[PDB]
Amino acid sequence: MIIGYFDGLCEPKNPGGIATFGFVIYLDNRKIEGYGLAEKPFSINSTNNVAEYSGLICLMETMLRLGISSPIIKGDSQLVIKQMNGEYKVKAKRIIPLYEKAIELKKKLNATLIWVPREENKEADRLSRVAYELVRRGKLR
C-alpha cells in the first residue's frame, strides 16, 4: 500500500516567517521524499496552513506525476485533514485556492487522507526543518 506523509512549518514567526514543507512517499522497495519553500521568505503570506497545504499539494502532485494511485496520505494537521474530508469549512481567502488544488488532486488520485499525531509524522516534520535550515543557509531560494 502506498503511503505518503506531509508537513509544513512556518518559523520563527507565524505569520511572517519562512514557510517550508516536507513530504515522504513509502513504496515497498524505495522511498521518494521532497522538501522546500512554500512561499517567499519572511513574506506576510507565509503561514503555517499555507505551508501545510503546500506540503500536501507537492506530495500529491509528485504522486500523480509518478503514476501512483489510491494512496493513503497522513498528516498531523487536524485542520487540513478535516477540511480535505469535507468536515471543516474553508473560508480563508488565501487557503481557498490551495484547498481547491488539493481537492482536485485528491480526486484524481483517489486518495484517502487521515490524521496521525505529530509523533507519528516525524520524517515529514524533519524534512520541513531541513528545508528551513537550507533557506537560512541560502541553499534554497
Numbering used by the authors: 1 to 141
Q: What do the authors of the reporting publication say about this deposited model?
A:
Ribonuclease HI from the hyperthermophile Sulfolobus tokodaii (Sto-RNase HI) is a monomeric protein of 149 amino acids.
The shape of the spectra was almost the same for the wild-type and variant proteins. Two molecules are contained per asymmetric unit. The root-mean-square deviations of the Cα atoms for the A and B chains of the ΔC6 variant against the wild-type protein were 0.446 and 0.436Å. The denaturation temperature is 102°C for the wild-type, 93°C for C58/145A and 78°C for ΔC6 Sto-RNase HI. These results indicated that Sto-RNase HI is a hyperthermostable protein with a denaturation temperature beyond the boiling temperature, and is destabilized by 9°C by elimination of the disulfide bond and by 24°C by C-terminal truncation. This is the result of decreases in ΔH and ΔCp.
